Design a binder for this molecule. Structure first.
Ligand SMILES: *[C@@](C)(CO)[C@](*)(O)[C@H](Cc1ccccc1)NC(=O)[C@H](Cc1ccc(OC)cc1)NC(=O)[C@H](C)NC(=O)CN1CCOCC1
Ligand SMILES: *[C@@](C)(CO)[C@](*)(O)[C@H](Cc1ccccc1)NC(=O)[C@H](Cc1ccc(OC)cc1)NC(=O)[C@H](C)NC(=O)CN1CCOCC1
Ligand SMILES: [Cl-]
Ligand SMILES: [Cl-]
Ligand SMILES: [Cl-]
Ligand SMILES: [Cl-]
Ligand SMILES: [Cl-]
Ligand SMILES: [Cl-]
Ligand SMILES: [Cl-]
Ligand SMILES: [Cl-]
Ligand SMILES: [K+]
Ligand SMILES: [K+]
Lengths: 248, 238, 199, 230, 219, 243, 244, 204
C-alpha cells in the first residue's frame, strides 16, 4: 500500500512543499488573469483559453464567477478544481448570510477557502487544488477590494495584480503604469487592455479572446456586470487607435 | 530482501520472514524453563540486569489463581498478552464461576496471535510464553510463540541458550512424573543453570520461581523466598 | 382471519378464509392467504396484513437462496425455522402468526406452527381470530390417518364453521394440497360451503 | 475484510501536469470515434458500433443512451467506465426532477456529472474515468450539446468529434458544419464525419445514432439508419 | 378523497375526485389525484396530501430510472412492490392509500396498497373517505369483461356517489383509461356541480381603502 | 510507441502512457490459466453450453467437478478461468438475481444479470486495492419477450449478447470456427445447435471425446428450465454425430 | 515458476502471465508440511496424518491436526497450523450459524462451499495475505452417505474418494489408487490408511513421527471422533509389518 | 394550537397581468402584542414574493433558509427563478421536515420572469402545493379570508381595482381575528413596477 503512496502532504529537505510548487507550474500554463483596483470600482480581466469557431457560448462567462451579491472572482489553473472551489465559495458566502443576515466581508470569504486549500497541503494525503484565484468585491468596512489566492492557501490584498501566463511580466508592467489613489475605472479599463495586449500570445487581441468584468457601487447597490462583446470591441479599438497616434 | 517488511508478504520459499524476525526477539531474552509432575507445574526463570546498579527484570507474571506465565522477548508485547489472558480468565470466572481450562485459554491466544500476522500494517507479537496451570486435567505446561502456533509439553525452555536446558530435560523427562515438588523445582533450576556460562551460576538475585498445582494457587518467590530452593544444591559439574 | 393445515401420508392440506378487515369494515372479501415460500412449501397468513406479507417475502427470499446453495428443494423444517426466526427477532414489532406446511423428500408431509417465535410440529394446526370457535370441533372430528379427500373435507368443515361464527372471517375457502406430484389449488365458493346448524 | 487507500493516485508532476488525467485522455483518444452536432432545431449523436465479428448480437448493448426524456449520451473511451457515468447521470436527473418538478437543464446535468468526474482525479485509491462524454439536450426550446472529460472540465459545442481521428473529424466539421441546419441534415453530416474515420463498410448494425428535439430524445431504429445510409 | 379502480376487457380504469381539505374547509376545488407513474401505469392517492404526492413522485422517479436501465415496458407489479416496501419501512406514518392500475405484457392489472404496506390484487377496488359509496356501486354493477364505455360509466357513478355522499369529497370526477394500446387521462370527465354564475357585484372605486404609506419601485 | 509503461501501471489498475490497464489485460491471461475452453451457441428455439470436463484421477469425485452453474431456474452459466474466482462470481450472481426479484417482483433478464456482474467487475478495474477476477461468465436463458439469449461478461467489465461465443485457451480458434458456421444459414434446431457446439470443441481440441469428457447445459423455449445433460443424454448426441 | 521484485508481493497484483503468486507461495507452505490423508469408504470416511515429532518434550497428542468442526464433520489440515486453526474456527462458526438459521446439521458440501468463500476472500487484496494451509472435510449420514471434500489456499473445493495433502501428496495418491474404497468397510480402510502414511514417511530426512487417525461413519453412528488406542495400534502394527 | 401562538394573516390575489400579496403587521405572544411593524412578506426576486403565516420563528427561519437555497440556485443556474420552481423548492424544504415540521403555511405570488404570466400558490406546513387562478389564503383567520375572497374576487381586475379588493378582503377578515392586525401591508406586482402600501387598519 505505502508502495503506491505518492506522499503528497510531506516536507522537502529544503523546507518546502513539492506538490504546492508543482501546482504553481500548472497556473503558469493557464490563462493570463489580471485584477485592478480603482477609486470608483474594481475589475477583472482574463484571457479566454476556450476559443474555437465551433464553441457555442452558452454561459455569460468562461473564467468569471459571481460568488455573492457584492463579490466576484476570476480563475487560473485546472478548471474542474476551480469549479469545486467557486461552488464552495458560494456556499461559505451563503452560510455567513444565513447566520448574520448581512453579506460576508471580502477578506473573510477568501480566508475561509484558503483554510480549506491549506488543509489539503497538511493532512489527508490528497493532491492540492491547482488553482489561483482573484477576488474582487465591496464590503462596508474596507470598500472596494482585490485579493489573490495561492494553491498554498496563502492570500494577500492588492491594488493591482496578475496570475497565469506571463504573470511576472504583466505585474511589472502594472507596477510602472498604476497611479496609486488616482486611478479611475476608465483608467483601469484602459490599462487592462494595454497589459493584456503585450502579455497575450496571438498578438492582435480580440473580443472573443478576452473577458472583462466590472464591479461598481451604484445607487446604494453593488452592481456586477460581465462586459458585452460590443463593449470589448470599443475597448480594444481605443487602444488600437492610440497605437496609431504613437509615431511622427 | 523485499519479502520481509510486511507480514502479508509470502516468501517464494513459502514463508513469512516477519514472523521469523519476531521469533528472534524471543531467543534474545533471558532463558526460562517450564516443567510438570503429575501434581505440580513449575516455572523457573532467569532475571537479567542491564547494569549492576539497576535491578533485575520481572520474568514471571500472574494470570489467575490457577494459571501463571514466564515471558521471553519484548516487554510491552508480553504485558499486552498478559492483560488479554487475565481478561479472559476474569470473564470466565465472571460468567461461569469456574476457572478457565488451560487448553482453552491457550487456544484463545492462538486465535488472537494469528489475527495480526494476516493483516497489513499489523505485526506479530514479539514475545514467547511458557504457561503453567492446573485444572480438572491436572498440571499443564504450554508454549506460545510470535507465530500463533502453540504446544502442549511435558517440559520446555525458551530464550538465550535454552538448547542446553532443553537437552537436560530431554534426558530426565521420564523422571518428572513421580517427582516430589522439591525435586521437581531442582530439576527446573538445574536445566536453567546449564544456560549460564561456566564462570557464573544461579544466585538469589537472578532466579525467579513460579509454582501452581493441586496443593496451592500460583505463587511467585523472588528474593529471600527463593533461597530454600537453591540451598541443597548438587555442584556444577563438567 | 381463519387459517388451517392438516398432515396426511403423501403430503399436506392448507386452508384459509378470504377476508381482510379494518375495524368493522371488510376491505377485501376475496384474499388468498396461502403464500408459497418454495415450490412445495406454502404458508398460511394471519394477523397484521402488512406484517404478515413482509415476513412471507423475506422467508421466500432466503429459502430461494438457501435452496440454490444446497442445490435441492429446501426442507420443510428449514422453511419453518426461517419464518420462526424473523418472527422471534421482531416479536414486538411484527404481529402475525404464520402456519408453514409443505412436503420434502427427507420427511414427507409436515405442518408447523410458528406463533410468536416458537416452533412446533403438529398432526394438524389452526390459527387466526376464528380459530377460537373451532377448537372443540377439531378435537372431536379428528382421526389419524385421514385420506387426502378426508383432510380436504376436515379443513373445509372447520373453516366453514369458524367463518359463520367469527365476524373477522368471511368470503371463500382457499385450499391447496401439496404432494410429491405437485400443488393442487382449489376454491370453495358460497354455494358450495357445507351446511350445519345456523340458528 | 478490507479498507481502501486514502491517498490520491493523481498527483502533480514537476512540470505541473496531472499525468493520470492526460493518461486517461489517451484512453479516450484511442477509443471508437463519436460525433455530436447541434443543429438549430435539434441535436444528433452518432458512434462507431463495430463489434468486429458477426458472432455478436448488435441489438443487445447500446452506446447511445437516454438519461431522461430530454437528454442523451454518447462516449469515446472505456465502455465499463461510461456505464457508471450513465447510471450516475440518470440518478442526478431524477434528483433534480424530484426537487424542482422541471426537466433538468442540460447545462446543470453536465456540471453535476463533471463534478463526479473531478472526484476521481483527487479522491484516494481510485483512477480517473477513461471516458469523455457527449451530452445532448432540449430545454427552454433550445438545443444543447456538451462535452465532459476525465479532467472534470466541460465544454459547449456547436459540433465536435472525439476518439480515433478526432483531429481529422474536427477539421472536417469546421469546413462542413454550418449553423442553422435542419435536424435531418445533421444526421447526414454526423454519419459523414463518422465515414472519415471508419475502415470497413457501413451497415445499420455497424453504427448507432440518437436524436434530440422538442419531442424529447430517442435512438434511431435500425430501419431509420438504413434510409440515411444512401 | 374518493378514489376507485376497475378492470375491464381491454384494460383498466382509475377514478378520483378533485377536493382537498385543510381541517374541515375545502382548500382546493380542483386538485389532481390521478398520478403519472409510467406512460401506461397510473396511481390514485388518498390520505395525507403531501404524502400521496411525494410517494407517487418518488415511485415514478424510480420507475423511469428502471425503464431506462432495462429498456423495457415498466411492470405494474414492480410499481406495487416498490410502493409497499417503501411504505412498510415508514410503518404507516406516510398516510398514503394508493390504487395502482396499468397494463403489462401480462395484461391489465389493478392493485391497492395501504399506508402500512399491505397489498391486494383485484378486479375492482375503492379507497379514501368515500370508499363506502364507491364499492357499493361497484359490488352492485360490476361484471367481468365489460366494454370500455360500460366500464367508464360505472366508474363515474362510483366516484359521483362518493362526491355526493361524502363531505370530504367534491369537485369533478377525473378518469384515466389504460389500454394495451395507450393511456387517456380524461381530466374533468364529468362535473356535477356548477355554481360559477351569480348576481352580486362587490367592487370598490379606487380610493375607498384608506392608505397611510405608498411606495413605488420602477423596473 | 505501442506497449509503453511508467510508474506502477503494471501493478495497480492505473493508466499507462498509452491509456491501457495492464492488470485488466493480465486478468484475461488468467482465464487461460484454467487450461479449458468453453463454447456457447444460440438457436431459434434454444441456447447451448458446452465445456471440457477434465478429470485428472479416479480419486476425484467426478460429480463435483463442473464449470456448469445454476443462478436461476431460467438462467444458467458456464465459467472459464480460475476455479475459485469463478465460484465467487457464481455466488454473487445468485445473490444479485434473488435480490432483483425481491425488489422488483419479476425474474431477472439474462441481459440485466450480465450488466450487474459487469458493473461490479468495473469496480475492481477502477479501485487500486483489489485485483480483477481472472474468470469468464457466459450466461444463457430465455427472455419471455426477446427469445433465447447468450451473454458474456469480462474482468474488464465489458458485456455483450452473442449468436455464438467461446472462452478460454482455444477461444480465438473457436470463434473463427463459429463464424464459418454462421455465414451459412442452417436450420437452428436443438440438435443443430448442440452439435455445432460439440463439434466446435471436438475440432479445435481434436479429441472425439467420451460422454464423460464433456459437460452440456441447455435452455429451450418449450422447457425454459436450465438442465445439465448427464452421461446418458450426452452419449445420445455423440452417437447421433456418428451417423 | 516464480516472479521476482514486483508481481509477487501483493495478492491484488496479477503477474504478466495471469498468475497470483501470493496464492502460489501460500500453496508452497502446505507442500512443505507433513502429509495429511483421508479416503472415502463404503460406510464412512477415515483420516490419517503423519505428525513430525519436533522434540520428545512435547506431549503425545499435542499439535492435533485432526479437528472436530461439527459433531458429524471432521477436519484434516496441512500447512501453517496457526492458519489451520483459524479456518477451523471459521468452519465451526459456519456449521453453528446454519443450525441457528435452518435447524439441522449442515450438509458437508455446503459447509465446504461456505468456508471456501472465506478462504478465497483473502486472495484478492493487498490488505491481507492468503491462508497458508490446505484442509479436508469428512462426514457421514444415511441420507447423504459418505462425503469427502478438500479446500486449498486459492479457495477451491472438490469432492474426493481419496485425497492427500503435504510433502508426499504424490506418493500417497498412487498408493490410494490401489484400493477398492468403493467396496471397503471403514474398519479395513484404517489399516490401509495407516500403512500409506508409513510408506509416505521419510525416516531419513525427517527425524520421527506420530500417526493421527480419525473416524466418521456408521460404526461411530455418524459422529466424527478419534480412532481408539486399540484399533490404531493394530493398524500401526499392520503398517510396520507389511512394509517389507 | 401551535399556529395559534403567534397568529398572522397572509393572502394572495390574481388580476389582469398582475398579482397582489398582503399580510398583517402584527408580532404578538398569545396575550399581548410586541411589535407593530413585523415583516411576513419577503421578496425572493424582482417580481416574485413569498408571504409567511404561522409561528414567527419558523416564518423567519424558512425565509432565511429559502433565501440560502434561492441564491445558490440563481448563482449555479444562469437565470432568475420561475414561480413554479420556487413553489417546488419550498415544497421540498418543508417536506424535509416531515416529522418535525416548520409551523408556517407559505403563500407565493409573482409574475413569471420572461413570460409575464401571473402565478399564485399556497402550501402546507409539510409542503403540499396549491395552485389556483384566483386567490390563496393562509393564517389563523383562513375562514374569514375565504369568506371575503369568495364574495369579492373577479376574473379580470386591473392593478387599481385589485389593490382595493385584496385590501378590503384583508381589512375585514383581520377585524374578526383577535390574533391578527396592527396594520396591513399590500404589495401590487406589475411588469413595469411594484407598489407597496400600508393601510389605515384598526390598531385594536
Ligand atoms: C383476519 C381476516 C382478521 O384480521 C386475518 O387475520 C387477516 C390476515 C391477512 C394476512 C395477510 C394479508 C391479508 C390478510 N388480517 C387482517 O385482515 C388485518 C387485521 C389486523 C389489523 C391490525 C392489527 O394490529 C397490528 C392486527 C391485525 N387487517 C389489516 O391489517 C388491514 C389491511 N389494515 C388495517 O387494519 C390497518 N391497521 C394497522 C394497525 O393499526 C390499526 C389499523
Ligand atoms: C380527501 C379529500 C379527504 O377526505 C383525500 O383523502 C385527500 C387526498 C389528496 C388531496 C390532494 C392531493 C392528493 C390527494 N386528503 C386531503 O384533502 C388531506 C386531508 C388530511 C388532513 C389530515 C390528515 O391526518 C393526518 C389526513 C388527511 N389534505 C391535507 O393533507 C391538507 C392539504 N393539509 C393538512 O390538512 C395539514 N395536515 C398535514 C399532515 O398532518 C396533519 C395536518
Ligand atoms: Cl524489550
Ligand atoms: Cl527460543
Ligand atoms: Cl390444533
Ligand atoms: Cl491508506
Ligand atoms: Cl469515490
Ligand atoms: Cl431510446
Ligand atoms: Cl417508492
Ligand atoms: Cl439549508
Ligand atoms: K475605507
Ligand atoms: K460494453
Amino acid at each position: 500500500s505505502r508502495r503506491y503512496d505518492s506522499r503528497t502532504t510531506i516536507f522537502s529537505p529544503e523546507g518546502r512543499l513539492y506538490q504546492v510548487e508543482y501546482a504553481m507550474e500548472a497556473i503558469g500554463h493557464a490563462g493570463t488573469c489580471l485584477g485592478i483596483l480603482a477609486n470608483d470600482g474594481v475589475l477583472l480581466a482574463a484571457e479566454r483559453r476556450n476559443i474555437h469557431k465551433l464553441l457555442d457560448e452558452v454561459f455569460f462567462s468562461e473564467k468569471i464567477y459571481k460568488l455573492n451579491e457584492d463579490m466576484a472572482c476570476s480563475v487560473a489553473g485546472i478548471t474542474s478544481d476551480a469549479n469545486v472551489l467557486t461552488n464552495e465559495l458560494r456556499l461559505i458566502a451563503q452560510r455567513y448570510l444565513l447566520q448574520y443576515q448581512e453579506p460576508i466581508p471580502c477578506e473573510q470569504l477568501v480566508t475561509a477557502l484558503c483554510d480549506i486549500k491549506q488543509a489539503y497541503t497538511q493532512f489527508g494525503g490528497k493532491r492540492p487544488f491547482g488553482v489561483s484565484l482573484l477576488y474582487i468585491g465591496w464590503d462596508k468596512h474596507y470598500g472596494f477590494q482585490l485579493y489573490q489566492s495561492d494553491p498554498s492557501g496563502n492570500y494577500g490584498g492588492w491594488k493591482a495584480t496578475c496570475i497565469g501566463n506571463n504573470s511576472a511580466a504583466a505585474v511589472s508592467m502594472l507596477k510602472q503604469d498604476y497611479k496609486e489613489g488616482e486611478m479611475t475605472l476608465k483608467s483601469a479599463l484602459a490599462l487592462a487592455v494595454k497589459v493584456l495586449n503585450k502579455t497575450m500570445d496571438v498578438s492582435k487581441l480580440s473580443a472573443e479572446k478576452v473577458e472583462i468584468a466590472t464591479l461598481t457601487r451604484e445607487s446604494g447597490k453593488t452592481v456586477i456586470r460581465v462586459l458585452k462583446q460590443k463593449e470589448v470591441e470599443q475597448l480594444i479599438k481605443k487602444h488600437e487607435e492610440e497605437e496609431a497616434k504613437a509615431e511622427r | 530482501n523485499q519479502y520481509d517488511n510486511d507480514v502479508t508478504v509470502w516468501s517464494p520459499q513459502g514463508r513469512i520472514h516477519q514472523i521469523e524476525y519476531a521469533m528472534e526477539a524471543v531467543k534474545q531474552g533471558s532463558a526460562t524453563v517450564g516443567l510438570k509432575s503429575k501434581t505440580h507445574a513449575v516455572l523457573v526463570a532467569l532475571k537479567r540486569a542491564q547494569s549492576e546498579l539497576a535491578a533485575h527484570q520481572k520474568k514471571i507474571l500472574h494470570v489467575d489463581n490457577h494459571i501463571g506465565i514466564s515471558i521471553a522477548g519484548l516487554t510491552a508485547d508480553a504485558r499486552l498478552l498478559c492483560n488479554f489472558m487475565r481478561q479472559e480468565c476474569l470473564d470466565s470466572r465472571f460468567v461461569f464461576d469456574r476457572p478457565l481450562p488451560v487448553s482453552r485459554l491457550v487456544s484463545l491466544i492462538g486465535s488472537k496471535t494469528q489475527i495480526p500476522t494476516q493483516r497489513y500494517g499489523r505485526r506479530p507479537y514479539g514475545v514467547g510464553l511458557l504457561i503453567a496451570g492446573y485444572d480438572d486435567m491436572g498440571p499443564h505446561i504450554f508454549q506460545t510463540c510470535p507465530s500463533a502456533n502453540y504446544f502442549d509439553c511435558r517440559a520446555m525452555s525458551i530464550g538465550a541458550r535454552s538448547q542446553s536446558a532443553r537437552t537436560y530435560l530431554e534426558r530426565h523427562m521420564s523422571e518428572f512424573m513421580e517427582c516430589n515438588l522439591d525435586e521437581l523445582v531442582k530439576h527446573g533450576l538445574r536445566a536453567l543453570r546449564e544456560t549460564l556460562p561456566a564462570e557464573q551460576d544461579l544466585t538469589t538475585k537472578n532466579v525467579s520461581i513460579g509454582i501452581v498445582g493441586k496443593d496451592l494457587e500460583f505463587t511467585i518467590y523472588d528474593d529471600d523466598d527463593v533461597s530454600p530452593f537453591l540451598d541443597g544444591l548438587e555442584e556444577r559439574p563438567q | 382471519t381463519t387459517i388451517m393445515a392438516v398432515e396426511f401420508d403423501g403430503g399436506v392440506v392448507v386452508g384459509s378464509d378470504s377476508r381482510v378487515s379494518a375495524g368493522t369494515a371488510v376491505v377485501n372479501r376475496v384474499f388468498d392467504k396461502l403464500s408459497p415460500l418454495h415450490q412445495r412449501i406454502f404458508c398460511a397468513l394471519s394477523g397484521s396484513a402488512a406484517d404478515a406479507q413482509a415476513i412471507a417475502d423475506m422467508a421466500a427470499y432466503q429459502l430461494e437462496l438457501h435452496g440454490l446453495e444446497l442445490e435441492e428443494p429446501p426442507l420443510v423444517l428449514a422453511a419453518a425455522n426461517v419464518v420462526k426466526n424473523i418472527s422471534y427477532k421482531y416479536r414486538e414489532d411484527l404481529l402475525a402468526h404464520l402456519i408453514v406446511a409443505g412436503w420434502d423428500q427427507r420427511e414427507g408431509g409436515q405442518v408447523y406452527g410458528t406463533m410468536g417465535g416458537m416452533l412446533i410440529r403438529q398432526p394438524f394446526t389452526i390459527g387466526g381470530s376464528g380459530s377460537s370457535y373451532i377448537y372443540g370441533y377439531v378435537d372431536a372430528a379428528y382421526k389419524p390417518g385421514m385420506t387426502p379427500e378426508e383432510c380436504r373435507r376436515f379443513t373445509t368443515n372447520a373453516i366453514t364453521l369458524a367463518m359463520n361464527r367469527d365476524g373477522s372471517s368471511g368470503g371463500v375457502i382457499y385450499l391447496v394440497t401439496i404432494t410429491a406430484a405437485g400443488v393442487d389449488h382449489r376454491v370453495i365458493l358460497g354455494d358450495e360451503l357445507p351446511k350445519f346448524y345456523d340458528e | 475484510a478490507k479498507r481502501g487507500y486514502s491517498f490520491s493516485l493523481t498527483t502533480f508532476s514537476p512540470s505541473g501536469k496531472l499525468v493520470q488525467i492526460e493518461y486517461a485522455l489517451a484512453a479516450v483518444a484511442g477509443g471508437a470515434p463519436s460525433v455530436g452536432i447541434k443543429a438549430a432545431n435539434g441535436v444528433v449523436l452518432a458512434t462507431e458500433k463495430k463489434q468486429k465479428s458477426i458472432l455478436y448480437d448488435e441489438r443487445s448493448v447500446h452506446k447511445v443512451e437516454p438519461i431522461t426524456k430530454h437528454i442523451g449520451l454518447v462516449y469515446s473511451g472505456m465502455g465499463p467506465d461510461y456505464r457508471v457515468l450513465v447510471h450516475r447521470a440518470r440518478k442526478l436527473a431524477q434528483q433534480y426532477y424530484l426537487v424542482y418538478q422541471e426537466p433538468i437543464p442540460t447545462a446543470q446535468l453536465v456540471q453535476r456529472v463533471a463534478s463526479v468526474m473531478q472526484e476521481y482525479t483527487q479522491s484516494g485509491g481510485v483512477r480517473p474515468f477513461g471516458v469523455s462524454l457527449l451530452i445532448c439536450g432540449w430545454n427552454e426550446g433550445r438545443p444543447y450539446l456538451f462535452q465532459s472529460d476525465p479532467s472534470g472540465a466541460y465544454f459547449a459545442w456547436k459540433a465536435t468529434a472525439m476518439g480515433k481521428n478526432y483531429v481529422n473529424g474536427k477539421t472536417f466539421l469546421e469546413k462542413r458544419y454550418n449553423e442553422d441546419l435542419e435536424l435531418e441534415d445533421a444526421i447526414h453530416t454526423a454519419i459523414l464525419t463518422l465515414k472519415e474515420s471508419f475502415e470497413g463498410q457501413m451497415t445499420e448494425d455497424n453504427i448507432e445514432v440518437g436524436i434530440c428535439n422538442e419531442a424529447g430524445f430517442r435512438r434511431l431504429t435500425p430501419t431509420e439508419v438504413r434510409d440515411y445510409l444512401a | 378523497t374518493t378514489i376507485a379502480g376497475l378492470v375491464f376487457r381491454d384494460g383498466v380504469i382509475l377514478g378520483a375526485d378533485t377536493r382537498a381539505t385543510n381541517d374541515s374547509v375545502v382548500a382546493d376545488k380542483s386538485c389532481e389525484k390521478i398520478h403519472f407513474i409510467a406512460p401506461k401505469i397510473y396511481c390514485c392517492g388518498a390520505g395525507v396530501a403531501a404524502d400521496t404526492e411525494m410517494t407517487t413522485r418518488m415511485a415514478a422517479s424510480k420507475m423511469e430510472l428502471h425503464a431506462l436501465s432495462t429498456g423495457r415496458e415498466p411492470r405494474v407489479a414492480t410499481v406495487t412492490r416498490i410502493l409497499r416496501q417503501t411504505l412498510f419501512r415508514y410503518q404507516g406514518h406516510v398516510g398514503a392509500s394508493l390504487v395502482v392500475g396499468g397494463v403489462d405484457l401480462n395484461g391489465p392489472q389493478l392493485y391497492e396498497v395501504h399506508p402500512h404496506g399491505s397489498y391486494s390484487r383485484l378486479p375492482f377496488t375503492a379507497l379514501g373517505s368515500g370508499q363506502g359509496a364507491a364499492v357499493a356501486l361497484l359490488e352492485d354493477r360490476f361484471q367481468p369483461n365489460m366494454t370500455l364505455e360500460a366500464a367508464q360509466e360505472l366508474l363515474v357513478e362510483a366516484i359521483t356517489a362518493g362526491i355526493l355522499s361524502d363531505l370530504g369529497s367534491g369537485g369533478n370526477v377525473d378518469a384515466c383509461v389504460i389500454t394495451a394500446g395507450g393511456a387517456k387521462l380524461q381530466r374533468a370527465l364529468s362535473t356535477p356541480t356548477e355554481p360559477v354564475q351569480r348576481a352580486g357585484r362587490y367592487r370598490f372605486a379606487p380610493g375607498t381603502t384608506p392608505v397611510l404609506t405608498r411606495e413605488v419601485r420602477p423596473l | 510507441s505501442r506497449g509503453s509503461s511508467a510508474g506502477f501501471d503494471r501493478h495497480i489498475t492505473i493508466f499507462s502512457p498509452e491509456g491501457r490497464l495492464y492488470q485488466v489485460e493480465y486478468a484475461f491471461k488468467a482465464i487461460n490459466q484454467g487450461g479449458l475452453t468453453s463454447v456457447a451457441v444460440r438457436g431459434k428455439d434454444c441456447a447451448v453450453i458446452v465445456t471440457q470436463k477434465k478429470v485428472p484421477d479416479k480419486l476425484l469425485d467426478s460429480s463435483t467437478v463442473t464449470h456448469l452453474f445454476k443462478i436461476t431456474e431460467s438462467i444458467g452459466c458456464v465459467m472459464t478461468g480460475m476455479t475459485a474466482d469463478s465460484r465467487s462470481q457464481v455466488q454473487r450472481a445468485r445473490y444479485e438475481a434473488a435480490n432483483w426479484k425481491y425488489k422488483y417482483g419479476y425474474e431477472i433478464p439474462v441481459d440485466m444479470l450480465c450488466k450487474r456482474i459487469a458493473d461490479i467487475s468495473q469496480v475492481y478495474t477502477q479501485n487500486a486495492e483489489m485485483r480483477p477476477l481472472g474468470c469468464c461468465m457466459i450466461l444463457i436463458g430465455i427472455d419471455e419477450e426477446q427469445g433465447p439469449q447468450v451473454y458474456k461478461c469480462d474482468p474488464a467489465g465489458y458485456y455483450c449478447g452473442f449468436k455464438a461465443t467461446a472462452a478460454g485457451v482455444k477461444q480465438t480458434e473457436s470463434t473463427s470456427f463459429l463464424e464459418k458456421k454462421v455465414k451459412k444459414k442452417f436450420d437452428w434446431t436443438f440438435e443443430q445447435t448442440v452439435e455445432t457446439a460439440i463439434t466446435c470443441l471436438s475440432t479445435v481440441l481434436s479429441i472425439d471425446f467420451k460422454p464423460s469428457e464433456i459437460e452440456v447445459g441447455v435452455v429451450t423455449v418449450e422447457n425454459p428450465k436450465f438442465r445439465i445433460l448427464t452421461e446418458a443424454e450426452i452419449d445420445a448426441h455423440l452417437v447421433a454425430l456418428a451417423e | 515458476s516464480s516472479i521476482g521484485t514486483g508481481y509477487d508481493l501483493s495478492a491484488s497484483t496479477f503477474s504478466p502471465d495471469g498468475r497470483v503468486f501470493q496464492v502460489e507461495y501460500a500453496m508452497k507452505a502446505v507442500e512443505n508440511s507433513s502429509t495429511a490423508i483421508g479416503i472415502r469408504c463404503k460406510d464412512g470416511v477415515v483420516f490419517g496424518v503423519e505428525k513430525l515429532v519436533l522434540s520428545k518434550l512435547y506431549e503425545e497428542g499435542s499439535n492435533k491436526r485432526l479437528f472436530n468442526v461439527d459433531r458429524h464433520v471432521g477436519m484434516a489440515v496441512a500447512g501453517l497450523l496457526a492458519d489451520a486453526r483459524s479456518l477451523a474456527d471459521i468452519a465451526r462458526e459456519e456449521a453453528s450459524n446454519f443450525r441457528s438459521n435452518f435447524g439441522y446439521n449442515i450438509p458437508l458440501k455446503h459447509l465446504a462451499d461456505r468456508v471456501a468463500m472465506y478462504v478465497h476472500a483473502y486472495t484478492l487484496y493487498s490488505a491481507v495475505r492468503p491462508f497458508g494451509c490446505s484442509f479436508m472435510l469428512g462426514s457421514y449420514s444415511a441420507n447423504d452417505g459418505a462425503q469427502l471434500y478438500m479446500i486449498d489456499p486459492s479457495g477451491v473445493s472438490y469432492g474426493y474418494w481419496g485425497c492427500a495433502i503435504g510433502k508426499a501428496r504424490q506418493a500417497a495418491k498412487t498408493e490410494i489408487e490401489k484400493l477398492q474404497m468403493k467396496e471397503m468397510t471403514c474398519r479395513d480402510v484404517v489399516k490401509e490408511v495407516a500403512k500409506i502414511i508409513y510408506i509416505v514417511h521419510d525416516e531419513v530426512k525427517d527425524k520421527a513421527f506420530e500417526l493421527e487417525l480419525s473416524w466418521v461413519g456408521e460404526l461411530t453412528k455418524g459422529r466424527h471422533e478419534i480412532v481408539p488406542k486399540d484399533i490404531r495400534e493394530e493398524a500401526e502394527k499392520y503398517a510396520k509389518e507389511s512394509l517389507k | 394550537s401551535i399556529m395559534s401562538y403567534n397568529g398572522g394573516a397572509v393572502m394572495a390575489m390574481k388580476g389582469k397581468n398582475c398579482v397582489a400579496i398582503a399580510a398583517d403587521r402584527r408580532f404578538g405572544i398569545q396575550a399581548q402584542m410586541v411589535t407593530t411593524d413585523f415583516q411576513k412578506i419577503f421578496p425572493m426576486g424582482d417580481r416574485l414574493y413569498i408571504g409567511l403565516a404561522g409561528l414567527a420563528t419558523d416564518v423567519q427561519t424558512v425565509a432565511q433558509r429559502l433565501k440560502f437555497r434561492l441564491n445558490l440556485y440563481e448563482l449555479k443556474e444562469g437565470r432568475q427563478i420561475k414561480p413554479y420552481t420556487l413553489m417546488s423548492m419550498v415544497a421540498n424544504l418543508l417536506y424535509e421536515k416531515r416529522f418535525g415540521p416548520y409551523y408556517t403555511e407559505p403563500v407565493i405570488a409573482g409574475l413569471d420572469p420572461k413570460t409575464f404570466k401571473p402565478f399564485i400558490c399556497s402550501l402546507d406546513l409539510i409542503g403540499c402545493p396549491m395552485v389556483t387562478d384566483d386567490f390563496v389564503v393562509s393564517g389563523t383567520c383562513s375562514e374569514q379570508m375565504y369568506g371575503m375572497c369568495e364574495s369579492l374576487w373577479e376574473p379580470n381586475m386591473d392593478p387599481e381595482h385589485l389593490f382595493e379588493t385584496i385590501s378590503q378582503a384583508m381589512l375585514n377578515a383581520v377585524d374578526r381575528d383577535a390574533v391578527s392586525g396592527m396594520g396591513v401591508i399590500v404589495h401590487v406586482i406589475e411588469k413595469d413596477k411594484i407598489t407597496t402600501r400600508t393601510l389605515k387598519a384598526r390598531m385594536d
